[PDB]
Amino acid sequence: GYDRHITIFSPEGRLYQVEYAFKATNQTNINSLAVRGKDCTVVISQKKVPDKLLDPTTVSYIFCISRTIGMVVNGPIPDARNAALRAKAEAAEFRYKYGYDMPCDVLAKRMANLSQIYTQRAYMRPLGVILTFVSVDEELGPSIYKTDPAGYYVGYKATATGPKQQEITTNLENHFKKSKIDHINEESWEKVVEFAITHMIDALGTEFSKNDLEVGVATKDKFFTLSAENIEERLVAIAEQ
Amino acid sequence: FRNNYDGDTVTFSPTGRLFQVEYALEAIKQGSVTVGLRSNTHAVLVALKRNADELSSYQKKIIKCDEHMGLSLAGLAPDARVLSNYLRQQCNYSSLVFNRKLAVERAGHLLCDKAQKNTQSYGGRPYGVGLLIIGYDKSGAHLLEFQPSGNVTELYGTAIGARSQGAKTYLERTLDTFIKIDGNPDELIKAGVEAISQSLRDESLTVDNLSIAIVGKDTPFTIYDGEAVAKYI
Amino acid sequence: GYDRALSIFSPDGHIFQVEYALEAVKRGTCAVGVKGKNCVVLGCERRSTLKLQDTRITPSKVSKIDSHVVLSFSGLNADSRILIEKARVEAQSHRLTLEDPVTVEYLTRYVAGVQQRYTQSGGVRPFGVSTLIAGFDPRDDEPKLYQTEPSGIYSSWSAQTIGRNSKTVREFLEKNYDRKEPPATVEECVKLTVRSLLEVVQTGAKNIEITVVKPDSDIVALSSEEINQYVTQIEQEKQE
Amino acid sequence: GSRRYDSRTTIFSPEGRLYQVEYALESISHAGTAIGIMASDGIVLAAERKVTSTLLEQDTSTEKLYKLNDKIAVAVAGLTADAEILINTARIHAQNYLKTYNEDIPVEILVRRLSDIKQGYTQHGGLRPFGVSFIYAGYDDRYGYQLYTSNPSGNYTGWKAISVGANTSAAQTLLQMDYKDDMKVDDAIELALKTLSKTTDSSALTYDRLEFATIRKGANDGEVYQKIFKPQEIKDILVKTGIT
Amino acid sequence: DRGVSTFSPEGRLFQVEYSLEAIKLGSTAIGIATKEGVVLGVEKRATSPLLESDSIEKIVEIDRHIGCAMSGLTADARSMIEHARTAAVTHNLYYDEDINVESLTQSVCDLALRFGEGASGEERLMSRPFGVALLIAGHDADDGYQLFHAEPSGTFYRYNAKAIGSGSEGAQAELLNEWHSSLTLKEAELLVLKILKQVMEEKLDENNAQLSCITKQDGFKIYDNEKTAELIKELKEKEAAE
Amino acid sequence: MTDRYSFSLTTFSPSGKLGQIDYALTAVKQGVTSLGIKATNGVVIATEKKSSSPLAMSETLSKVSLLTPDIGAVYSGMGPDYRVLVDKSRKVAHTSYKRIYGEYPPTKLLVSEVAKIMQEATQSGGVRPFGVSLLIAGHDEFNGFSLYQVDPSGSYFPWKATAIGKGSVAAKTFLEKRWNDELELEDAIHIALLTLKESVEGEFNGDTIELAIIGDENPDLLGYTGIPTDKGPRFRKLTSQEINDRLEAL
Amino acid sequence: ILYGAPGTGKTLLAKAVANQTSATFLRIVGSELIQKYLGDGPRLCRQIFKVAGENAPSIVFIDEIDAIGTKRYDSNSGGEREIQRTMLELLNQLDGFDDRGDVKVIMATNKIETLDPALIRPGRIDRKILFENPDLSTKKKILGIHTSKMNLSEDVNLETLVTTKDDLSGADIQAMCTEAGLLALRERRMQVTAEDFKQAKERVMKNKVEENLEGLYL
Amino acid sequence: TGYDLSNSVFSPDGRNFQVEYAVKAVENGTTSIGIKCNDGVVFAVEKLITSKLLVPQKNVKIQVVDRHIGCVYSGLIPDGRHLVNRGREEAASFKKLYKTPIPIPAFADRLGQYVQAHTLYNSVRPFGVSTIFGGVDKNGAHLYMLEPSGSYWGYKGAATGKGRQSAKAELEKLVDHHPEGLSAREAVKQAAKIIYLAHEDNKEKDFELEISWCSLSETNGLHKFVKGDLLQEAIDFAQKEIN
């Protein structure tokens, strides 16, 4: 029908184009976890293993916007790479005109308002991908801002993406009630990766190998992604506990 | 097909081949037929001139572009005029900047990129006229076959227009003949007259409907008509 | 059908949008005029039957373009006022450039071009109002009467009518007016013009407005009692 | 007929009249009834408000009556989104005449130019025509007091007394019977309150739902002065005329 | 979308094809290009005696030695007439010379072969498709007397005797016989009147029929009503003897 | 066929009224219940915040923003629709006023400029107007306290007590139920808490409830001292810890 | 082919001709030609020409066709499949019928655009009569019939009543005079006089047509 | 449904049908493969011979990027050349500002945003071709294939076209041949054999073998065409294996 092809309001107020935006995010069946520690933030994304004809180093679900800042995207690939190019452009331009680092609170706001600009364009299609921004703020500290393809972003104690997100939220909710804190212990950023993966395996219910996962790490004034040898080193330390 | 897939140039098909391009090729089938072939040192094009009625004069389908180059227009009339001035501008732009005449392989790349921009853009009508372009450059004689989709293919010789299969059958058996003839521009023109004769259904056999153009390493591109082409006929 | 588009020529050779624009003219007011040897006369019908309407503040239907050139029309006034403004600006632009008074032939070709340009422009609605441009050429006493049609063409006429019951008045214009010998006197051309208007007006005075143009840039407007005087003379022949 | 194109104003209707103008008249009738009155010594403006809600503050807001300049006060009836765009544009254009010619713009000059602004959207461009019903009230030294109306077709018509909105034919009939050739300012106020009382569902004719503006030439030194009375003063004239 | 969608495409463009019927609805114009001159004629199509035939003119003069005619909507013609007059003074500007008939026709057809607003390598003027049937005839120092029909659809063709309008189909059948390479200037004037009288719906008269001639000495000359009436009596005298 | 869901962008609604406004008001009805109370000595606004996931931080969502220190605002509807509107609405108040008159925009001018953006969205085709409804409350020297209801159709009207969102019809009677125009600001906050509590009974605390007030200036929020001329901010946002204090005293 | 409304256009024109032609009036309802049964279409059409096919002292009249006149494309949307094959047999019965014109077939519908081009058969039907708006002279002929019975005052002539006439052809001139004679019964008089004409026509011309066709579009 | 009539519209399946039809249109084109070695990459393209009128070394579809990157695609020929001609300007634009040749992962970002934006534009028709590019930059050998949907990743081998099913099985065998991968000269003989195996569906027509590669050993980081005895050796090597 013609009413399902239009971006503007529907008769029931439920946009059909937006329902397909969230539906396309689960097309890849990727389960990622984003949690907040004390002084650090570690985010792990599920890495699908293709055949031997693909380079696993090139395949990544996490893009580096800048130092301390990182983004994981789950959804359509062609809209995932183009969305990363827009976040990097606004990050460098904001550090020039205003001469200050672009926080994920604002970095999730720019892409959220940019999605509404795409809805105002008839020829341009809005982004159907989820933009999850994580960093360590100078004041607020660890913060997670997950931008829906419809431009919705709000801070989270712990969040995930996938069909098991309901099971991940429930498992992490009862764990935070015992300690009464939303931050992971062991302030050392090396041990934060251990718990962030440990709570993910118990929530997903399936153990993953070094090639099945990609572990992003956002520290103070530094950002990096653990390679295949570093992720394998984490699995050895997690196995002993 | 009516609407559904391939209703617009942007609209694709379940197979993936746009049928709107094939519709533009249909005008070339019943359009003016032309036959051409080339050797290492020479290139020949024989085009049939059409008319409305007996009182209507025959119009030359061969249009001059460069001194060493030539082309024949079979297809939609208005689409063939813009591509003509485009090639005329590139030949002058290459002579003004690079001082060199526009290369044949370079003319095909610019002509392919010209018609491709209007194809990928919404709206507008793509070019449905066929172009057989010959030219003499440092690389020698070359003949390009321009399809309405923009495809460019290098051949010894080919033919488009009404009953184009008649000349193609002649060029397959004689392929080893005209390629070995060098320095004899008369024998290459005689082969073109016998090639179009098998293609034609014998509507009008007179001289005024045939326009023969030839270019080579010595004589540049020149369009002949009247008693000039009547010697071979 | 073809009423949704303009540039489409239709298999009948005539755009249906222009034909539908003529339907508004068929219900429009009656505009009749006749040019004589020494003068041109243009009548018009403005209905005064509407109650609580001040005639002093009501703009006249006849629009003054040049000193010796006036303008009359029939149709939607909202569309004509744009045509009137574009003609008046060009009317002043004629003396702003050529220094000569407005030419009837040049003004009609401009108004036809205004109808042409806005029709040839995509997304712009054409004017479905027929305008009558009359007047004398500069330093010439020969009368010039031109018309405009929604099809974007113009033509000249000795006597022409538009609006409601245009075919009925047209029969009155062909039989009772001789092109070979137009009326020489001013009173004869005005009296015969009223008789054509009395068909659509049906015995009324304030519903008839006639503006007579005279040589050497003279515009006269007949009052209500002066127009009603010609009505009385016509009724004398009917009651006889 | 069967296939009717409502999309673009450039598309002509089979009858010749745009159907968007027909349906725009229905939107005017859905709003409140506004009746302008042109008198010899001034212009009396009276209208009723559509909002019946008590929680809304009627005394601090004027939905219909607005002021273009000192000599012109208009009452708009129609879409609010289209009103503020045309009224502000009218205020800009009216001051532009005062910029060039250092004078106040006459009514006929302003009304004729504002009518072509609505027609500009229908004449060219794929934009929307603004269905609006104004009330043109002002005074100049040329023709005197001029009372005009604005139809959705973008035209203007001279009216001595006119009613727009709901009960258009019902209120206009009552005005034609009691109409006076002189139209005294005091009689124009009594004529307005008498007609609005019959066309309003409320028999008491509350003051908070009414907008009362009066132009009078009998001010000091014979100058035109526009004064919109407060709702407290609107209740006072209701007792003098005998409504309450 | 009615005519731009529902059709089953054969690889044709139905936009201009609908205008082909409007071409046949235009005024009937017949002309013959000979070695001693070019005789042209049109039809006034007066539906009422109050129409002024001297005020309206269906032929325009692009150059002193080159005439023109039109059959179709006058609105679409005025854009082409002003464009043809612009190209005429353009050649008189840069090269300061009378442009050839074939060279002028190709320059006029440059606008008739382009349509639409957006483009790539060529400028655009008209915002919507249009068309008009224009017959361009004249004389030059290259090919001599030439007559070309300007078609907004395809490329113009060279016609020695061309007929346009409603009677264009049947008149060309008569031009395949009566026309001959030995026709002089006087014989061409009487041949057009014999053909025009039959193809025209109304009776032959000086008011409803206007003809013109194109020669080298006189350039573009229009036959006066008195001169035309003299040629009408010569046609009636010849038909009376046969 | 049926209507194409036009804003009057390129097409006027044949029904005589725009049908998508009611569908845009459906998006307004889709919003949370947000109310406000206009009193003599102050104006109070109350709204509820969506819980969504239990791990979502409640301090990130702010449904009451700051335009000028003397004027507050509250909205109900889609999240990103309010941000694009206000980001443009701020630049209008700066250029058209604050870059000319060099002061803080009053209540009459600021609210009018916000509705003009919605008017441009309805007039300009291809751009859909945002379906959020804003309740703007402010205090100036000219008109004093003001409470305006900004509809997506481009119309605004003053209201003593009004509600928007799903409880727009329900809470409008509830505000008139317990509150009257003769009541002051202090007794109005208690009424706003009782009416908003009926919207959802799950959590009434300050986490999911954002309460803000307009009233006498606060010198702690001015940021500087020494100048008696410049007035302090008349808008003070209540901290969630302070909101629970009003709940125990409710 | 006739156009108009029943009682004036599709009635008065049909019955007026049968009087001067001295032919029996034969009426066949257009809906009765299709009985909703297969085979009744061609059967009932042949029987119409059979009654008039002996001495031919009559003329066939058919009025008010909303059904068989439109077959559409299918048996829905107002059309029927039996209508497609019925209109074809009526063509064979129209061409096969040959006489000097003693019997005619007169059918009147609202629109002929949905008719079968076969049954149209140009040259068999040369007459298309569209309903036109009569002038003021039409009312003078209708008044003269009733004024011969009802007596009128000397101050009111045929030119007085024809003054106000709005979109009425022949049907309501009798209906307007009905109210003109009804108002006189309130005044207890059998002869309508000048005082009655003014008050009676105002109750007629007013309060009837709600829609207004007016030139205030401006 | 009507999702194919309007470009850049979300389908109920999550991907636009026009984007899906562009992917299926690549299978109708010729089969083009590639091999990524340690010291460089090797490209092999298959070209179907229309008739005997074709002249060799004319219609070759091998495209060049700077001096260190070769380029080849599979799909519509006119649609593929416009994407390459734009990429030629992208490599030159980077050369103007940064005064250095463009690396391979940077060349994919420019063509990535170029194609992915067109899939987001209605006024621009998406590409129906799949481009295979690679070479040796300052960072070493890299290989990337740009799909018509806009997605691309690093590939140790490239397969597309109609014979991609038979070619993918042979590319996975490269690990079985040697654990470290074949050399530069060994990959040319290996890539040629895959063309003959993928030619089983095209056996009704003739073919012309065209192979190009760029490495740091022989060419020293230059894009050249395989000729001389190296081209004839790869032909005779595969003809003996297919026996």
PDB file of all heavy atoms in Angstrom, chain D residues 86 114-122 129-134 136 150-154:
ATOM      1  N   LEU D  86       0.025  35.543   6.872  1.00  0.00           N
ATOM      2  CA  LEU D  86      -0.495  36.602   6.014  1.00  0.00           C
ATOM      3  C   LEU D  86      -0.595  37.933   6.751  1.00  0.00           C
ATOM      4  O   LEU D  86      -0.372  38.991   6.153  1.00  0.00           O
ATOM      5  CB  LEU D  86      -1.860  36.201   5.454  1.00  0.00           C
ATOM      6  CG  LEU D  86      -1.874  34.992   4.518  1.00  0.00           C
ATOM      7  CD1 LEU D  86      -3.298  34.624   4.132  1.00  0.00           C
ATOM      8  CD2 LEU D  86      -1.030  35.261   3.282  1.00  0.00           C
ATOM      9  N   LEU D 114      -3.018  42.454  -1.238  1.00  0.00           N
ATOM     10  CA  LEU D 114      -3.078  41.249  -0.419  1.00  0.00           C
ATOM     11  C   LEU D 114      -3.882  40.147  -1.099  1.00  0.00           C
ATOM     12  O   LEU D 114      -3.650  38.962  -0.837  1.00  0.00           O
ATOM     13  CB  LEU D 114      -3.673  41.564   0.952  1.00  0.00           C
ATOM     14  CG  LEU D 114      -2.867  42.478   1.878  1.00  0.00           C
ATOM     15  CD1 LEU D 114      -3.657  42.786   3.141  1.00  0.00           C
ATOM     16  CD2 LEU D 114      -1.526  41.851   2.221  1.00  0.00           C
ATOM     17  N   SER D 115      -4.826  40.516  -1.968  1.00  0.00           N
ATOM     18  CA  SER D 115      -5.619  39.511  -2.667  1.00  0.00           C
ATOM     19  C   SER D 115      -4.781  38.732  -3.672  1.00  0.00           C
ATOM     20  O   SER D 115      -5.003  37.531  -3.862  1.00  0.00           O
ATOM     21  CB  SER D 115      -6.807  40.172  -3.366  1.00  0.00           C
ATOM     22  OG  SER D 115      -7.698  40.747  -2.427  1.00  0.00           O
ATOM     23  N   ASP D 116      -3.820  39.392  -4.320  1.00  0.00           N
ATOM     24  CA  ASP D 116      -2.950  38.712  -5.272  1.00  0.00           C
ATOM     25  C   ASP D 116      -1.899  37.847  -4.593  1.00  0.00           C
ATOM     26  O   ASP D 116      -1.298  36.993  -5.253  1.00  0.00           O
ATOM     27  CB  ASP D 116      -2.269  39.732  -6.185  1.00  0.00           C
ATOM     28  CG  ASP D 116      -3.237  40.388  -7.150  1.00  0.00           C
ATOM     29  OD1 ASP D 116      -4.349  39.850  -7.332  1.00  0.00           O
ATOM     30  OD2 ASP D 116      -2.887  41.439  -7.727  1.00  0.00           O
ATOM     31  N   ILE D 117      -1.662  38.046  -3.294  1.00  0.00           N
ATOM     32  CA  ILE D 117      -0.712  37.203  -2.577  1.00  0.00           C
ATOM     33  C   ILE D 117      -1.256  35.786  -2.443  1.00  0.00           C
ATOM     34  O   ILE D 117      -0.530  34.806  -2.649  1.00  0.00           O
ATOM     35  CB  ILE D 117      -0.377  37.820  -1.208  1.00  0.00           C
ATOM     36  CG1 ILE D 117       0.363  39.146  -1.393  1.00  0.00           C
ATOM     37  CG2 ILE D 117       0.453  36.856  -0.373  1.00  0.00           C
ATOM     38  CD1 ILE D 117       0.546  39.928  -0.113  1.00  0.00           C
ATOM     39  N   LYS D 118      -2.540  35.654  -2.100  1.00  0.00           N
ATOM     40  CA  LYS D 118      -3.164  34.335  -2.077  1.00  0.00           C
ATOM     41  C   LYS D 118      -3.204  33.725  -3.471  1.00  0.00           C
ATOM     42  O   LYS D 118      -3.008  32.516  -3.635  1.00  0.00           O
ATOM     43  CB  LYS D 118      -4.577  34.428  -1.501  1.00  0.00           C
ATOM     44  CG  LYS D 118      -4.646  34.809  -0.034  1.00  0.00           C
ATOM     45  CD  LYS D 118      -6.093  34.952   0.409  1.00  0.00           C
ATOM     46  CE  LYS D 118      -6.195  35.302   1.882  1.00  0.00           C
ATOM     47  NZ  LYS D 118      -7.609  35.506   2.299  1.00  0.00           N
ATOM     48  N   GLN D 119      -3.460  34.550  -4.490  1.00  0.00           N
ATOM     49  CA  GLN D 119      -3.541  34.045  -5.854  1.00  0.00           C
ATOM     50  C   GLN D 119      -2.177  33.606  -6.373  1.00  0.00           C
ATOM     51  O   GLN D 119      -2.100  32.740  -7.252  1.00  0.00           O
ATOM     52  CB  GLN D 119      -4.150  35.110  -6.768  1.00  0.00           C
ATOM     53  CG  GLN D 119      -4.419  34.640  -8.186  1.00  0.00           C
ATOM     54  CD  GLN D 119      -5.418  33.502  -8.235  1.00  0.00           C
ATOM     55  OE1 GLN D 119      -6.555  33.636  -7.784  1.00  0.00           O
ATOM     56  NE2 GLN D 119      -4.993  32.369  -8.779  1.00  0.00           N
ATOM     57  N   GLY D 120      -1.096  34.181  -5.840  1.00  0.00           N
ATOM     58  CA  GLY D 120       0.234  33.794  -6.281  1.00  0.00           C
ATOM     59  C   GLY D 120       0.549  32.334  -6.025  1.00  0.00           C
ATOM     60  O   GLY D 120       1.274  31.706  -6.801  1.00  0.00           O
ATOM     61  N   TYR D 121       0.012  31.771  -4.940  1.00  0.00           N
ATOM     62  CA  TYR D 121       0.225  30.354  -4.665  1.00  0.00           C
ATOM     63  C   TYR D 121      -0.562  29.482  -5.637  1.00  0.00           C
ATOM     64  O   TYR D 121      -0.082  28.422  -6.057  1.00  0.00           O
ATOM     65  CB  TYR D 121      -0.156  30.036  -3.220  1.00  0.00           C
ATOM     66  CG  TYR D 121       0.718  30.719  -2.192  1.00  0.00           C
ATOM     67  CD1 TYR D 121       0.355  31.944  -1.648  1.00  0.00           C
ATOM     68  CD2 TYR D 121       1.904  30.138  -1.764  1.00  0.00           C
ATOM     69  CE1 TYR D 121       1.151  32.573  -0.708  1.00  0.00           C
ATOM     70  CE2 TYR D 121       2.707  30.759  -0.826  1.00  0.00           C
ATOM     71  CZ  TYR D 121       2.325  31.976  -0.300  1.00  0.00           C
ATOM     72  OH  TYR D 121       3.121  32.597   0.635  1.00  0.00           O
ATOM     73  N   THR D 122      -1.772  29.910  -6.004  1.00  0.00           N
ATOM     74  CA  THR D 122      -2.565  29.164  -6.973  1.00  0.00           C
ATOM     75  C   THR D 122      -2.089  29.393  -8.401  1.00  0.00           C
ATOM     76  O   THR D 122      -2.223  28.500  -9.246  1.00  0.00           O
ATOM     77  CB  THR D 122      -4.042  29.547  -6.859  1.00  0.00           C
ATOM     78  OG1 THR D 122      -4.188  30.956  -7.076  1.00  0.00           O
ATOM     79  CG2 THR D 122      -4.580  29.195  -5.487  1.00  0.00           C
ATOM     80  N   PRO D 129      -2.725  27.038  -1.336  1.00  0.00           N
ATOM     81  CA  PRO D 129      -3.514  28.259  -1.146  1.00  0.00           C
ATOM     82  C   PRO D 129      -4.007  28.346   0.288  1.00  0.00           C
ATOM     83  O   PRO D 129      -4.371  27.339   0.900  1.00  0.00           O
ATOM     84  CB  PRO D 129      -4.677  28.085  -2.129  1.00  0.00           C
ATOM     85  CG  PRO D 129      -4.831  26.605  -2.252  1.00  0.00           C
ATOM     86  CD  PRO D 129      -3.441  26.028  -2.133  1.00  0.00           C
ATOM     87  N   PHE D 130      -4.019  29.561   0.828  1.00  0.00           N
ATOM     88  CA  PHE D 130      -4.468  29.779   2.198  1.00  0.00           C
ATOM     89  C   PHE D 130      -5.943  30.152   2.161  1.00  0.00           C
ATOM     90  O   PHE D 130      -6.298  31.257   1.737  1.00  0.00           O
ATOM     91  CB  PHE D 130      -3.658  30.886   2.871  1.00  0.00           C
ATOM     92  CG  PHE D 130      -2.188  30.595   2.988  1.00  0.00           C
ATOM     93  CD1 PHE D 130      -1.290  31.625   3.215  1.00  0.00           C
ATOM     94  CD2 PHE D 130      -1.703  29.303   2.878  1.00  0.00           C
ATOM     95  CE1 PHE D 130       0.062  31.375   3.328  1.00  0.00           C
ATOM     96  CE2 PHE D 130      -0.348  29.049   2.989  1.00  0.00           C
ATOM     97  CZ  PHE D 130       0.533  30.085   3.215  1.00  0.00           C
ATOM     98  N   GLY D 131      -6.808  29.238   2.597  1.00  0.00           N
ATOM     99  CA  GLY D 131      -8.193  29.592   2.832  1.00  0.00           C
ATOM    100  C   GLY D 131      -8.280  30.500   4.038  1.00  0.00           C
ATOM    101  O   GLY D 131      -7.938  30.085   5.158  1.00  0.00           O
ATOM    102  N   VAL D 132      -8.764  31.724   3.844  1.00  0.00           N
ATOM    103  CA  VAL D 132      -8.821  32.725   4.906  1.00  0.00           C
ATOM    104  C   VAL D 132     -10.001  33.642   4.624  1.00  0.00           C
ATOM    105  O   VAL D 132     -10.300  33.951   3.467  1.00  0.00           O
ATOM    106  CB  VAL D 132      -7.511  33.545   5.012  1.00  0.00           C
ATOM    107  CG1 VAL D 132      -7.654  34.642   6.049  1.00  0.00           C
ATOM    108  CG2 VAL D 132      -6.311  32.673   5.363  1.00  0.00           C
ATOM    109  N   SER D 133     -10.675  34.077   5.687  1.00  0.00           N
ATOM    110  CA  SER D 133     -11.692  35.119   5.604  1.00  0.00           C
ATOM    111  C   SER D 133     -11.249  36.279   6.486  1.00  0.00           C
ATOM    112  O   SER D 133     -11.234  36.158   7.716  1.00  0.00           O
ATOM    113  CB  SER D 133     -13.059  34.589   6.033  1.00  0.00           C
ATOM    114  OG  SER D 133     -14.040  35.610   5.990  1.00  0.00           O
ATOM    115  N   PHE D 134     -10.890  37.400   5.863  1.00  0.00           N
ATOM    116  CA  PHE D 134     -10.539  38.598   6.607  1.00  0.00           C
ATOM    117  C   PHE D 134     -11.761  39.497   6.775  1.00  0.00           C
ATOM    118  O   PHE D 134     -12.852  39.220   6.272  1.00  0.00           O
ATOM    119  CB  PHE D 134      -9.425  39.384   5.912  1.00  0.00           C
ATOM    120  CG  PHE D 134      -8.092  38.691   5.887  1.00  0.00           C
ATOM    121  CD1 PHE D 134      -7.628  38.098   4.725  1.00  0.00           C
ATOM    122  CD2 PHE D 134      -7.276  38.691   7.006  1.00  0.00           C
ATOM    123  CE1 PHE D 134      -6.389  37.484   4.690  1.00  0.00           C
ATOM    124  CE2 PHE D 134      -6.040  38.073   6.980  1.00  0.00           C
ATOM    125  CZ  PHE D 134      -5.596  37.470   5.821  1.00  0.00           C
ATOM    126  N   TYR D 136     -11.836  43.677   6.235  1.00  0.00           N
ATOM    127  CA  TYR D 136     -11.009  44.829   5.897  1.00  0.00           C
ATOM    128  C   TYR D 136     -11.706  46.094   6.382  1.00  0.00           C
ATOM    129  O   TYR D 136     -12.756  46.476   5.856  1.00  0.00           O
ATOM    130  CB  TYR D 136     -10.746  44.869   4.394  1.00  0.00           C
ATOM    131  CG  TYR D 136      -9.935  43.692   3.901  1.00  0.00           C
ATOM    132  CD1 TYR D 136     -10.296  43.008   2.749  1.00  0.00           C
ATOM    133  CD2 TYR D 136      -8.820  43.250   4.603  1.00  0.00           C
ATOM    134  CE1 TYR D 136      -9.561  41.926   2.299  1.00  0.00           C
ATOM    135  CE2 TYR D 136      -8.078  42.172   4.159  1.00  0.00           C
ATOM    136  CZ  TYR D 136      -8.454  41.513   3.007  1.00  0.00           C
ATOM    137  OH  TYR D 136      -7.720  40.438   2.563  1.00  0.00           O
ATOM    138  N   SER D 150     -12.443  38.980   2.161  1.00  0.00           N
ATOM    139  CA  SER D 150     -11.443  38.142   1.507  1.00  0.00           C
ATOM    140  C   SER D 150     -12.003  36.734   1.359  1.00  0.00           C
ATOM    141  O   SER D 150     -12.224  36.039   2.356  1.00  0.00           O
ATOM    142  CB  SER D 150     -10.135  38.131   2.297  1.00  0.00           C
ATOM    143  OG  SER D 150      -9.178  37.285   1.683  1.00  0.00           O
ATOM    144  N   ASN D 151     -12.233  36.320   0.121  1.00  0.00           N
ATOM    145  CA  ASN D 151     -12.670  34.972  -0.198  1.00  0.00           C
ATOM    146  C   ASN D 151     -11.467  34.062  -0.397  1.00  0.00           C
ATOM    147  O   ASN D 151     -10.358  34.532  -0.671  1.00  0.00           O
ATOM    148  CB  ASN D 151     -13.534  34.988  -1.458  1.00  0.00           C
ATOM    149  CG  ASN D 151     -14.878  35.654  -1.236  1.00  0.00           C
ATOM    150  OD1 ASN D 151     -15.370  35.723  -0.110  1.00  0.00           O
ATOM    151  ND2 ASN D 151     -15.477  36.151  -2.312  1.00  0.00           N
ATOM    152  N   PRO D 152     -11.644  32.744  -0.257  1.00  0.00           N
ATOM    153  CA  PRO D 152     -10.518  31.829  -0.507  1.00  0.00           C
ATOM    154  C   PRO D 152     -10.005  31.868  -1.937  1.00  0.00           C
ATOM    155  O   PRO D 152      -8.892  31.391  -2.190  1.00  0.00           O
ATOM    156  CB  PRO D 152     -11.100  30.453  -0.152  1.00  0.00           C
ATOM    157  CG  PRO D 152     -12.574  30.612  -0.325  1.00  0.00           C
ATOM    158  CD  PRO D 152     -12.861  32.013   0.137  1.00  0.00           C
ATOM    159  N   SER D 153     -10.774  32.420  -2.879  1.00  0.00           N
ATOM    160  CA  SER D 153     -10.296  32.597  -4.244  1.00  0.00           C
ATOM    161  C   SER D 153      -9.270  33.715  -4.370  1.00  0.00           C
ATOM    162  O   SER D 153      -8.698  33.886  -5.453  1.00  0.00           O
ATOM    163  CB  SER D 153     -11.474  32.873  -5.182  1.00  0.00           C
ATOM    164  OG  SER D 153     -12.344  31.758  -5.254  1.00  0.00           O
ATOM    165  N   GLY D 154      -9.021  34.471  -3.306  1.00  0.00           N
ATOM    166  CA  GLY D 154      -8.063  35.558  -3.365  1.00  0.00           C
ATOM    167  C   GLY D 154      -8.576  36.811  -4.037  1.00  0.00           C
ATOM    168  O   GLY D 154      -7.854  37.425  -4.833  1.00  0.00           O
TER     169      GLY D 154
END
